[PDB]
From Swiss-Prot:
This is Thrombomodulin. N-glycosylated. The iron and 2-oxoglutarate dependent 3-hydroxylation of aspartate and asparagine is (R) stereospecific within EGF domains. Glycans are attached at residue 5. It is found in: Membrane. The lineage of its organism: Eukaryota, Metazoa, Chordata, Craniata, Vertebrata. It is linked to Thrombophilia due to thrombomodulin defect: A hemostatic disorder characterized by a tendency to thrombosis. The chain holds residues 405 to 444 of 575 of the full protein. It comes from the Eukaryota. It comes from Homo sapiens (Human). Disulfide bonds join 4-9, 13-21, 23-35. Endothelial cells are unique in synthesizing thrombomodulin. Residues 1-36 form the EGF-like domain.
Length: 40
């Protein structure tokens, strides 16, 4: 349950949560390898 840790940020796979990048279980990355979901 972690989509980049917020609306849209980056995907450097934090070294204490590994939530970004890998993206939630179904978030789906986007143009930018950033984990987010506010439009496309």
């Amino acid at each position: 349950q972690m989509f980049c840790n917020q609306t849209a940020c980056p995907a450097d796979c934090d070294p204490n949560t590994q939530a970004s990048c890998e993206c939630p279980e179904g978030y789906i990355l986007d143009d930018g390898f950033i984990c987010t979901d506010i439009d496309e």
